[PDB]
Symmetry: C2
């Protein structure tokens, strides 16, 4: 009941403010500030994620938001180009809640884990391009998650909500780069990418950074948390 | 093109007075285009209802699904849906450009865009429209019909009238800030009362 960081479920876990500091430090190093950059934020649509989006916009005045269910990126390549209209910073995060150690973290990720648990993971592993019209964002997310879970050969019997949440982060990150490739020419602009897992510790807000880098002058440099 | 057009704050006056007739404050779902310029009506809506959630997609597409609507409805209910126009809705103008140059399916590289694009095609073909003749305010108005029953399909999947009052405010946002309303009703204690302004 002190630092409330038994959240080592994600080794990289930081305070959200601690987190935001490192970012603008690392980002200032590469020429990014609230001065010259536009931020795109992508979180889950749920209201519990608003604290992270607010911190980011506190630093980045020029900002646009593309939140999808469970953090899925259904705005696509047009949704992205719409917002960027020379220095861009993309933040993408799924999100999880942990008491100490346990209204619903991520609603989508909860239902999905169950889906993978009761039915197969195989039931959801569809060809990309397909969705249930009754639940477009959710099912697009299931499937991408399913493909990803199969892609790094994961023992589903041993998959828990943190593990799933961490597959979502690798997934949402990968999708982000696929849009970024279509929508951003590293010859024309410099940009950055910050991804990770948002963690609601109900009261303290944490963030576990995952993949971070800058593409400056057509040259990519990775950034770890310290 | 939009004979229903009003100023946006007049609208938000008639709307809240109308709604006040049965309900007032109530949670609110807002669904507009992701574009920034839609924020005018957003904040005005929130202005009246502090309990809210937003479900914006490209052009106003309701890809939030039933689960999206259910997650937001956990604290009776009132639903706002509007596409828009002025670069008006870059999305509708992109679909329009398309409709005049060319089932649970989508481009992975533009899911919201192409989902809406499909739902408009169906609305276009249903209503029996000449695409050569279709222009931007026509498709916008279509999109208002598309977005509305979409919303409606989502609603009494998500909402049980025997237990909840809900309300529906739809229409078209117009910039040069105007709102041309369209389908507006309340359902209270069971009884559905459509609303026309004026
Ligand atoms: Zn969520
Ligand atoms: Zn638009």
């Amino acid at each position: 009941q002190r630092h409330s960081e038994l959240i080592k479920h994600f080794p990289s876990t930081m305070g959200v403010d601690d987190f935001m500091g490192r970012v603008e430090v690392a980002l200032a190093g590469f020429g990014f500030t609230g001065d010259n950059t536009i931020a795109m934020t992508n979180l889950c649509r749920d209201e519990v994620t608003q604290v992270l989006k607010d911190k980011i916009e506190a630093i980045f005045g020029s900002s646009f938001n593309t939140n999808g269910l469970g953090g899925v990126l259904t705005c696509g390549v047009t949704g992205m180009k719409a917002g960027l209209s020379e220095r861009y910073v993309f933040f993408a995060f799924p999100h999880i809640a942990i008491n100490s150690e346990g209204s619903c973290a991520c609603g989508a990720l909860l239902a999905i884990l169950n889906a993978f648990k009761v039915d197969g993971v195989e039931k959801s592993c569809k060809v990309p391009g397909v969705h249930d019209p009754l639940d477009p964002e959710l099912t697009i997310l299931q499937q991408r998650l399913a493909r990803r879970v199969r892609y790094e050969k994961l023992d589903v019997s041993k998959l828990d909500l943190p593990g799933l949440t961490s597959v979502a982060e690798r997934t949402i990150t990968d999708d982000l780069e696929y849009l970024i490739e279509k929508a951003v020419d590293p010859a024309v602009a410099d940009y950055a990418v910050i991804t990770g897992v948002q963690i609601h510790n109900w009261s303290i807000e944490f963030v576990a950074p995952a993949k971070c880098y800058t593409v400056v002058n057509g040259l990519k440099t990775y950034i770890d948390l310290p």
